[model samples]
Target: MDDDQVAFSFILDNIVTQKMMAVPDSWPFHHPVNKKFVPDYYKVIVNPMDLETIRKNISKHKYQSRESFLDDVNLILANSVKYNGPESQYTKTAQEIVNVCYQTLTEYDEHLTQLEKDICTAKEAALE
Candidate 1:
C-alpha cells in the first residue's frame, strides 16, 4: 500500500481503536436488571445473550472487526473484576471467575500488542 493509505489506516485505526477500547464501559454487560432470588415487577425475559455474543454483534455496528470487539469485551470484564470483590461467597466465586478471564485477556492483549510492534518494526526496517 502507499504511504498515504498506510497513514490513513493508522489514523483511522487509532481513532476507532480508542472508541473500541472504551466499548466495555458503554456496552450492556452491566445493564441494570432485577435482582436474582428476589423477583421484582421488573422481570427479565428468559432469552439471554452472553457478553461475548453481544459484544461480537455490537462490534458489527461499529468500525471494529469481531475479534477486536471481543477483545475489548474481555478487557472490560477483566477490569470489572475488582468491583466484584469479596463482598460475599457469591462475589468471591465471581471474582475467581473474572480473575481467570482477566489473566487470559491481559495475556492475549500483550501478545497482540507485541505482534503489532513487531510488524511496525519490520516495516520501519524495510522502509529505511
Candidate 2:
C-alpha cells in the first residue's frame, strides 16, 4: 500500500498481529504479510513514513508521541546501515556512498524525527 494508507489498524490487521505474528508462540523469522521473510531494509524503509502515519493516527487511536516513533525509525535505519553492502555498479564512489548515507539518514532520521515530534506534540499532550 502507499505510505499514506499504511495505517496502524491496517498494518495491525494485515501484517503485524495477523500476518507477522499469527501464531500464538514465537516466530522470529516469519514475515508480517506472509510466510516470506522481510529483510531489514524492507522493514526499515517503511519506518520513516509509517512513523508519521502512526503519529497522525494516534490523535484518535491511542498512540504514542512522534519522538518514540521517529526514534524507532532512526534506530532501524541505523541498524540497516550497519549491514549496508558496497555501492552498486552504477553508483561507485566514496561520495556516492556518503551521499546515500546522508540522504537516507536525512529522510529517515532528521526529517522523520522532526515530523514525528511535531505531530506528537500536536496530537498528544506530552511525549515520553
Which candidate wins on TM-score? 1
Give me the overall lDDT of model 2. Answer: 0.36
> In candidate 1, which residue ranges exceed 4 Å CA deviation?
1-37, 41-86, 114-128
* Candidate 2 ranges with C-alpha deviation above 4 Å: 1-63, 85-128
Estimate, for each residue in 1-128, the C-alpha lDDT of model 1 and write its tens digit.
33432332343344333433233333334333325743641333333323444334443443122254446444444434433343644344434434544454454565445444654565677786
Backbone clash count, each prediction separately:
0, 1
How high a TM-score does candidate 2 get?
A: 0.25
TM-score of each: 0.31, 0.25
Deviation of model 1 at 11, angstroms: 24
Top model by lDDT, which number? Answer: 1
